[PDB]
Design a binder for this molecule. Structure first.
Ligand code: SF4
Ligand code: SF4
Ligand code: FES
Ligand code: FES
Ligand SMILES: [Fe+3]
Ligand SMILES: [Fe+3]
Lengths: 635, 635
């Protein structure tokens, strides 16, 4: 088996060979077993929204041509897409809401393991929301912020403030004119589920406008999540760490935090440090916390916790034989981990009531008892380490250096070393003079249909050589970090001369041995909201709307409904947005044309669907350069 | 073509012949074109919750056996079902919320077309909710009720009051012990969409418990909808009217109200009466408003507006050639109506922003301008009548007499004529002495897979002969009314001697020429909440929980996600609940076993899946009789 056809990560390839000889089924094996996949589903031409279904429509040929109730291909495709957007928005609803309740508990004295760690961020959020701070106690300010967060989930006398206060007024005006500003986060989710149910909305344009509005409810959840996590756990600043499977250590208790919410992982990290002696009593060197997926990104960004792996290759951490525990909250966890754990010895532990996996151990994690619950969880990990005494493990000796922690505040601060009172100006100067061609955000998942990381690295290499400033989040950041794109030592190899000059000038002004890394890691998937903050700040500084900026996004290997939601809000706020996997929309040309073309006339953004990464890079460059030309700039 | 294989309604058969010779495609033709339907979808063994899909699992045989992410058949089936429940709950969220906003506007002076029509109901709801009334203005009481309604959509310091205040404390306690009381209506909908997204909840029991909780959010929406509609439009009392296509009149402007919300249809009815002279100026006798689906049920129950048709046969009203307008809000409207309108001349008019149909005319309907918007809509209808001057129409001369309007208040009042201060006692006495074997609620849709009305009438006939008191809502009530089950003249033919004696004694005490009708029409689908009120009142009077009462439900020909949600809350509140179509759960035996068996140990209710109606009737009788035996009663 040619493992490089499955993943371009050599550590993953090594574990795939191990899984094969041990007879352990992987995500790639389950994919092979699924081929050929259903063409109706692949194109979006299937509906199960009532008990008269399933209905399907032949992409081409003869009957069936229409759903039983009369639903056309346009309607069916648009309804399916809208439900995916709502599902993504719901995941970010759950995440943000979790943090809002935690902040509220903390400042009410009900969860002493949590506290206001970033007072400056708290006050800045309060001011943005219009909440008074002068003469007010921090705990009361925080209580008001938490109440405002929770209020954005339902209808009230104002729209969703985590949309209207985070985008420039001109953008809010454009969106309002089209009826696209959400009334409430969970309100929009419910309205999508209603309008897409049988015998309701049956006009493609109307349905898709609803989807754009629900995508902004998702944006609000993301931005709220980042805001609240920064208050509770600290705003990221530049950090140095490592990534890939080689960060596991045979002589340590290896504990992966996996899922999404720092409410959980942040405490695991702090408590693990207090349990060092207890781990040593058990014959370990200590507890080695490592990250998977977004919650890994959260603790990487804030604490420099090394990232083990991401997304599609998550099972491979277990295959090493050295993963003593995998601590889960929710989202993007392959439920296969629960059965693979039987083979590998790993203790898989769920912690949230709405996210259990048959065969896992469930240990409820209450914010009110976070430290004690964390100790219980970590003691299971220690017991597991003891059980593998004398057992061979195979940790690929493969890892990269990673510089990360580029929050928007961190980026502005780094730039301020070149211009203290106008920090964005040096960036803009270099866009204008051509040293920086534009900005591309890589975001989102890996997808088993695409050799792992192949689209991210192929596109990033082409853009970097063309002097594009590249930023990344989520498992896109994960892909790029595992392939060396966050190691400043690789700037000479990867970057165009203009971009190199800029990364070097900024790094040198920040007292570094040299440049910023080739790609700036802006955090987890909710932290795509940080990229919004940066872009909106640039828009405001320039006095133009986001759809005039040379900024694009690429979900190069997208998988989750959350990726569909984020991609859709990227388009809604005005960005050309690449998706590198086939979305289930191709069964309807009219829907495809709306999403890739006519939406430009509504929001200024648009999707670029392109499965070939070299071609995608060309299309992204063309989009950046069109923006440059629109600003009167050379390109 | 043997049209009786499609529908057992002779008026529908006649219109099917007309559609055939005119080449107009119908729902039955679109169904035929869809055969054979996908077996993966039919069994629930398909997942499209991420862009790695579509995934499927062979019901039997070889691979694929598991989803790409590791999702088992149990997980996939349970996640799909949970999303259907959430979608149903969302439709009732939208409906109830619409009414809450309307009530609020009315009493704030912003929508003068609306008012408090049922003051007694307003005060009784206030008291149930714990809202003070003494010394308070009606408008302020109503404002508090509307605010309480809107508050139940989100988390707050109390659970959903439209669950906890409408079920007996012992039932609330059972549900609370299992964590099943909703925190907020839209909150639960969003949590379902989150937990069922990729890489989240992956334990069938955990998922299904979540579904039961979300079904109670649906119950709350239903009960809220009925409560608010009764306040605004009046609580139904016994009425006499007619049903089936023969209620259309060639010499009148025929206007169908179709969809769900009385906010719209109630005004159409009142305004149509004011426009009689304008219709006569146009050469009509007047405006003949007729009902389709639930909004038809709403105006039938309150005003005796005749019901034209229901559910699967809705297109047939248009095929007569005499339907001048079809006025739509949302839900259960086949979008085919928009294209069929081109052939038939009918003006199809949408009115709600989130429910448009390509090719229809959209006329926005604002509560703030209800009368003017209604006149605009009706003037389109009048213009349409004028266009068919001299054109032959074919209205089947087929209709039945219908006695309806049996709200729970109406039922209690009718019983009170036998016992003024203990109205429920005569009903209970007759259950105990065997004159009434038990109670069966028929609810829900028709479904093109089942010859229209065949399950409803077959099951009802068997139960009535066995002295079961039958009540009905929605298009189940529609089926039964179109086949004569709401005409008291048919009591001798249909009813067992015991039931006849009871219906006669109650009717005679209410001053009738004779009995109540064979089946009691309790209203629209949200008015399934009326049946809950009745059953809960019986439970409270007897001092036992609902799962000890000889009461069952049958969604004999279910279709919509709303039917799945209602069926699931029927089970959750403790009822044996029949479904007469194949739900997409058979691909997982463990899920099937939970829903049809082990859930008894949680809530006392359970599903009875049975496609053969004679067998379903036997199973329903067995369930009733088991309840009788549990109470120590003969059977
Ligand atoms: S909603 Fe329409 S297209 Fe979808 S399953 Fe039902 S009948 Fe088929
Ligand atoms: S969630 Fe799992 S089972 Fe569903 S489509 Fe994605 S990979 Fe397949
Ligand atoms: S027919 Fe395959 S996804 Fe429905
Ligand atoms: S394979 Fe047919 S419903 Fe998906
Ligand atoms: Fe993530
Ligand atoms: Fe209905």
């Amino acid at each position: 088996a040619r493992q490089n056809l499955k993943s371009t990560d050599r550590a993953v390839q090594q574990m795939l060979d191990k899984a094969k000889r041990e007879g352990i089924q992987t995500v790639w094996d389950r994919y092979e077993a699924m081929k050929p996949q259903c063409g109706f589903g692949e194109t979006g031409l299937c509906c199960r929204h009532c008990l008269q279904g399933p209905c399907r429509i032949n992409p081409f040929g003869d009957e069936p041509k229409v759903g039983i109730c009369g639903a056309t291909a346009e309607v069916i495709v648009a309804r399916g897409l809208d439900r995916s957007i709502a599902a993504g928005a719901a995941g970010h609803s759950g995440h943000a809401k979790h943090l809002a309740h935690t902040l509220k508990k903390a400042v009410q004295g009900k969860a002493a393991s949590y506290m206001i760690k970033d007072r400056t961020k708290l006050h800045s959020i309060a001011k943005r929301l219009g909440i008074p701070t002068e003469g007010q106690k921090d705990e009361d300010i925080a209580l008001e912020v938490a109440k405002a967060a929770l209020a954005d989930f339902h209808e009230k006398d104002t729209p969703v403030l985590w949309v209207t206060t985070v985008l420039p007024p001109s953008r809010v005006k454009v969106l309002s004119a089209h009826g696209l500003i959400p009334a409430g986060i969970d309100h929009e989710i419910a309205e999508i589920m209603h309008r897409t149910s049988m015998g309701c909305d049956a006009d493609a344009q109307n349905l898709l406008l609803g989807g754009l509005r629900c995508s902004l409810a998702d944006l609000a959840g993301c931005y709220m999540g980042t805001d609240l996590a920064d208050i509770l756990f600290g705003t990221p600043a530049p950090v140095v760490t490592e990534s890939n499977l080689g960060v596991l250590k045979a002589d340590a208790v290896n504990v992966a935090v996996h899922g999404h919410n720092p409410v959980l992982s942040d405490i695991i990290v702090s408590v693990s440090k207090e349990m060092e002696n207890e781990a040593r009593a058990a014959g370990a060197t200590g507890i080695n916390v490592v990250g998977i997926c977004c919650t890994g990104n959260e603790v990487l960004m804030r604490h420099g916790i090394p990232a083990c792996t991401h997304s599609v290759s998550q099972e491979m951490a277990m295959i090493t034989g050295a993963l003593d525990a995998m601590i889960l909250d929710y989202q993007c966890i392959q439920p296969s981990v629960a059965t693979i754990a039987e083979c590998t010895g790993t203790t898989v532990i769920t912690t949230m009531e709405m996210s259990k996996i048959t065969g896992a151990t469930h240990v409820n994690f209450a914010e009110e008892a976070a430290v004690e619950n964390a100790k219980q969880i970590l003691r299971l990990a220690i017991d597991t380490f003891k059980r593998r005494k004398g057992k061979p493990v195979e940790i690929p000796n493969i890892k990269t250096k990673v510089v990360a922690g580029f929050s928007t505040e961190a980026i502005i601060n780094a730039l301020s070393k070149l211009n203290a009172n106008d920090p964005l100006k040096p960036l803009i100067d270099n866009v204008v003079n051509g040293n920086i061609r534009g900005v591309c955000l890589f975001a989102g998942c890996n997808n088993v249909k695409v050799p792992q990381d192949q689209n991210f690295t192929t596109i990033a290499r082409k853009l970097l050589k063309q002097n594009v400033l590249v930023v990344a989040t989520g498992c896109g950041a994960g892909a790029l970090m595992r392939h060396g794109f966050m190691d400043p030592a690789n700037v000479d190899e990867l970057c165009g001369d203009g971009l190199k000059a800029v990364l070097t000038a900024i790094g040198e002004a920040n007292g570094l041995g040299g440049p910023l890394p080739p790609v700036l890691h802006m955090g987890s998937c909710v932290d795509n909201s940080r990229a919004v903050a940066l872009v909106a700040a640039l828009a405001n500084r320039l006095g133009v709307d986001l759809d005039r900026l040379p900024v694009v996004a690429s979900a190069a290997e997208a998988m989750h409904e959350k990726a569909v939601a984020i991609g859709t809000w990227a388009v809604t706020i005005g960005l050309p947005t690449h998706i590198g996997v086939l979305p289930p929309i191709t069964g309807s040309l009219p829907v495809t044309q709306i999403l890739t073309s006519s939406v430009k006339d509504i929001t200024g953004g648009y999707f670029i669907v392109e499965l070939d990464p070299e071609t995608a890079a060309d299309k992204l460059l063309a989009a950046i350069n069109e923006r440059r030309a629109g600003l009167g700039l050379p390109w």
